[PDB]
RNA sequence: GUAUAGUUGAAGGAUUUGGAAAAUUCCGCUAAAGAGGGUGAAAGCCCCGUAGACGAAAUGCUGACAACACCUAGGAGGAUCCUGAGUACGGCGGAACACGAGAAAUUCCGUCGGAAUCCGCGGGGACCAUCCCGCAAGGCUAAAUACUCCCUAGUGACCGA
RNA sequence: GAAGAGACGGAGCCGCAGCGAAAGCGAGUCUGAAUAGGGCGAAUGAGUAUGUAGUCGUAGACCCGAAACCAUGUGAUCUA
């Protein structure tokens, strides 16, 4: 689940606060799904974001 | 005030009147003093530097242990008490130059020139030209006017044949009517000038 | 650089024309039922500088 | 005056202190600082305005006021400046000025009323005071808020 | 035109102290050259040079103008058509803006909801009405600015084991 | 312009008017029913540009000295 074949969605990081503003480091990852799609006529399996399945 | 006129040796034509707002103005002294110091102190390059404890290419571990050796405590090889250490408060590259208000600069120039008028040290020529750069003839010209000490020559514009014949003994130095500074004038004893160089001074200084 | 002037004093103190500073007095935000009525009249009116405490502060308020 | 006989202006170039250079100069062995304590360490001294842990002066007295967002304030010239414009000029907040009377007119020239005028001018401005009109027109001049 | 080898380039003798003179003393000369370095001790006239004038078969580099490649038009009409989509924007969680969720626009990122088409859309520090200023979601773009491993030519009230 | 004196350049800054949180008023203003009293001002009371010296602030800031903390790397030829 590394990148998107279509859009540019990929993992990153950011803070995490809790009710008195202490900060730790997260990993905010995209939703990703393995879908069988058609690359150039040949069927392929690739990671595709749930946003671009509309 | 007035100064007589000499040709090349053709002596005593008429005289020239000069401005009594430039050449008669009862010179100050402390202004001239500070102008000389500010001019001469502006000539420096500040280029000089010294490495210190962070730039001396050494090491960054304590040489020893803190106790057990029975010994004074040291934390780095290179630090100012050692030989070959950094230097505390070394000299660094700086500026040295500064400027004054505009009134005192012109007050200084007017003061110096009225001073050298007041001791008969301007010797005024009608015109000066040579067909070719001959340094011998210029020496004969200064022999005509009876000048022996340190001297100044002031020109109009590109009189190349009156400039190229003055790479003499350093009694002689060459200025146009533009670059007449303060340290150019005060270091000399007598000043030569044409008629029109004086008038172009009287246009600039006003 | 420049002296960064303090902002705790910029929000509490104004400068008059003689050189001193106006100061809004204390004890004006609270249990007024404890204090009497001279004490809540006479602590309405702002006052001036005590000369000793104009010594350590004067350089902080270099311009405002 | 020439190069080898320079004289400075008297009382006008001092010498220095060189501190920590011998016991009989006056300032050797602790350099004008004295015995122990944190004023005599390397770079000691507390920050400005500090009374120990006592709450200092700026927390014993309350915050007060605010600042207008559209304060429009003028470039006051009172009246005695006007008394050198002999007879009739259209004294005006524009090209007239030219001699250091008004540099950086802040929001337009206002005219106050201190204190005595014997002229017969005529005035353009942007605001007047209630005694300024009386004092000008007492001498017989025309005023206008333009 | 310039960069990488170069050519020419003026003018002094004798005496005294010296181991050795450029030192000293008489009498001369040159300068578009009196910056510097060396020579048996401190030299304008002993040497290498400096001012000035001259010079490239070969390989670059910079301009100029010829060729060759490109690229670019007016005025009137306003029926119809086109003007960047899972985008703008909203909720929820975080980062950027001087701005720490605060009364918080403007910019992104994650997830879930999800517009209009010139009678249109965005913005003017929550939000509405009026006025004003502008066309997002497709690209490209010299100079003014920062640095010096190095190459050439220099300078310094910088150091002198 | 010679790493320079040496002129052009009036954007900007400071003093010449203050009082009020502010709208504003102005040799006056603020609180106040008040023109009463009081505060701060006013009544002649000069600044500005540069040099230099004393002192302070930001910079390691008068130098030498820790036990420790954090981030890349090197080591199981000694030993478990």
From TrEMBL, chain A:
GO CC, any one term: ribonucleoprotein complex
Ranges where the record places region Disordered: 1-27
Entries under NCBIfam families matching the protein: L28 (TIGR00009)
Gene Ontology biological process terms, A to Z: translation
Pfam families found in the cross-reference section: Ribosomal_L28
Family of this protein: Belongs to the bacterial ribosomal protein bL28 family.
Coiled-coil ranges per UniProt: none
GO molecular function, one term: structural constituent of ribosome
Bias (Polar residues): 9-25
InterPro entries the record matches: Bacterial_rp_bL28 (IPR050096), Ribosomal_bL28 (IPR026569), Ribosomal_bL28/bL31-like_sf (IPR034704), Ribosomal_bL28_bact-type (IPR001383), Ribosomal_bL28_sf (IPR037147)
UniProt keyword list: Ribonucleoprotein, Ribosomal protein
Protein name: Large ribosomal subunit protein bL28
From TrEMBL, chain B:
Basic residues biased stretches: 59-70
Function: One of the primary rRNA binding proteins, this protein initially binds near the 5'-end of the 23S rRNA. It is important during the early stages of 50S assembly. It makes multiple contacts with different domains of the 23S rRNA in the assembled 50S subunit and ribosome. Forms part of the polypeptide exit tunnel.
PANTHER family: 50S RIBOSOMAL PROTEIN L4, LARGE RIBOSOMAL SUBUNIT PROTEIN UL4M
Parts forming coiled coils: none
Similarity section: Belongs to the universal ribosomal protein uL4 family.
The keyword Ribosomal protein is assigned to this record: yes
One GO BP: translation
Any one GO MF annotation of this record: rRNA binding
GO CC, one annotated term: ribosome
Annotated InterPro entries: Ribosomal_uL4 (IPR002136), Ribosomal_uL4-like (IPR013005), Ribosomal_uL4_dom_sf (IPR023574)
Name the record gives this protein: Large ribosomal subunit protein uL4
UniProt organism field: Enterococcus faecalis
Chain segments carrying region Disordered: 48-77
Keywords: Ribonucleoprotein, Ribosomal protein, RNA-binding, rRNA-binding
NCBIfam families named in the record: rplD_bact
Subunit-level organization: Part of the 50S ribosomal subunit.
One Pfam family from the record: Ribosomal_L4
Listed HAMAP family: Ribosomal_uL4_B
TrEMBL record, chain C:
Pfam families from the UniProt entry: Ribosomal_L35p
GO MF, one annotated term: structural constituent of ribosome
A biological process from GO: translation
The keyword Ribosomal protein belongs to this UniProt entry's keyword annotation: yes
Keyword Transport attributed: no
Assigned keywords, A-Z: Ribonucleoprotein, Ribosomal protein
Region feature Disordered, mapped onto this chain: 1-52
Signal peptide region: none
This protein's GO CC annotations: cytosolic large ribosomal subunit
Compositionally biased region (Basic residues): 1-15, 22-44
Family according to the record: Belongs to the bacterial ribosomal protein bL35 family.
UniProt cross-references to PANTHER family, sorted A to Z: 54S RIBOSOMAL PROTEIN BL35M (PTHR33343), LARGE RIBOSOMAL SUBUNIT PROTEIN BL35M (PTHR33343:SF1)
Protein name, as recorded: Large ribosomal subunit protein bL35
Organism: Enterococcus faecalis (Streptococcus faecalis)
Encoding gene, per UniProt annotation: rpmI
TrEMBL record, chain D:
Range of residues in the leader sequence: none
PROSITE patterns per record: RIBOSOMAL_L15
InterPro entries given in the database record: Ribosomal_uL15, Ribosomal_uL15/eL18, Ribosomal_uL15/eL18_sf, Ribosomal_uL15_bac-type, Ribosomal_uL15_CS
GO biological process: translation
Region (Disordered): 1-51
GO molecular function: rRNA binding; structural constituent of ribosome
List of residues binding Mg(2+): 29
Compositional bias of kind Basic and acidic residues: 1-10
Pfam families per the UniProt record, alphabetical: Ribosomal_L27A (PF00828)
Keyword vocabulary terms for this entry: Metal-binding, Ribonucleoprotein, Ribosomal protein, RNA-binding, rRNA-binding
Bias (Gly residues): 23-35, 42-51
Any one annotated GO CC term: cytosolic large ribosomal subunit
All copies of domain Large ribosomal subunit protein uL15/eL18, residue ranges: 76-144
Family listed: Belongs to the universal ribosomal protein uL15 family.
Quaternary data: Part of the 50S ribosomal subunit.
Function of the molecule: Binds to the 23S rRNA.
Name assigned to this protein: Large ribosomal subunit protein uL15
């Amino acid at each position: 689940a590394k990148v998107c074949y279509f859009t540019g969605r990929k993992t990153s990081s950011g803070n995490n606060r809790s009710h008195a503003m202490n900060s730790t480091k997260r990993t905010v990852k995209p939703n990703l799904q393995k879908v069988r799609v058609l690359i150039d006529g040949k069927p392929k399996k690739v990671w595709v974001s749930a946003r671009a399945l509309k | 005030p007035n100064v007589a006129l000499f040709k090349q040796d053709g002596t005593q034509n008429g005289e020239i009147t000069l401005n009594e707002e430039i050449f008669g103005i009862e010179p100050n002294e402390s202004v001239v003093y500070d102008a000389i110091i500010m001019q001469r102190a502006s000539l420096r390059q500040g280029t000089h530097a010294v490495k210190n404890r962070s730039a001396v290419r050494g090491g960054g571990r304590k040489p020893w242990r803190q106790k057990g050796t029975g010994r004074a405590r040291q934390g780095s090889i290179r630090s100012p008490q050692w030989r070959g250490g950094g230097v505390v408060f070394g000299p660094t590259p700086r500026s040295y130059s500064y400027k004054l208000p505009k009134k005192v600069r012109r007050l200084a120039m007017k003061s110096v020139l009225s001073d050298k008028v007041a001791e008969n040290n301007l010797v005024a020529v009608e015109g000066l030209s040579f067909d070719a750069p001959k340094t011998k003839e210029f020496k004969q010209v200064l022999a005509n006017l009876s000048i022996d000490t340190k001297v100044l020559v002031v020109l109009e514009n590109g009189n190349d044949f009156a400039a190229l014949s003055a790479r003499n003994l350093p009694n002689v130095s060459v200025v146009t009517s533009d670059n007449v500074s303060v340290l150019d004038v005060v270091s000399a004893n007598k000043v030569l000038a044409t008629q029109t160089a004086l008038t172009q001074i009287e246009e600039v200084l006003a | 650089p420049k002296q960064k002037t303090h902002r705790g004093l910029a929000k509490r103190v104004k400068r008059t024309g003689g050189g001193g500073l106006k100061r809004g007095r204390a004890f004006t935000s609270h249990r007024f039922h404890g204090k009497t009525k001279k004490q809540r009249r006479q602590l309405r009116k702002a006052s001036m500088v005590a000369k000793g405490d104009y010594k350590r502060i004067r350089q902080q308020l270099a311009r405002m | 005056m020439k190069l080898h006989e320079l004289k400075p202006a008297e009382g006008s170039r001092q010498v220095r202190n060189r501190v920590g250079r011998g016991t009989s100069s006056g300032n050797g062995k602790t350099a004008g600082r004295g015995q122990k304590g944190q004023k005599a360490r390397s770079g000691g001294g507390v920050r400005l305005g500090f009374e120990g842990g006592q709450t200092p002066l700026f927390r014993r007295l309350p915050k007060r006021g605010f600042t207008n967002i559209n304060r429009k304030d003028y470039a006051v010239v009172n009246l005695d400046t006007l008394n050198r414009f002999e007879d009739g000029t259209e004294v005006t907040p524009v090209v007239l000025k030219e001699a250091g009377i008004v540099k950086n007119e802040k929001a337009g020239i206002k005219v106050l009323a201190d204190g005595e005028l014997t002229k017969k001018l005529t005035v353009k401005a942007a605001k007047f005071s209630k005694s300024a009109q009386e004092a000008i027109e007492a001498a017989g001049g025309s005023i206008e808020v333009i």
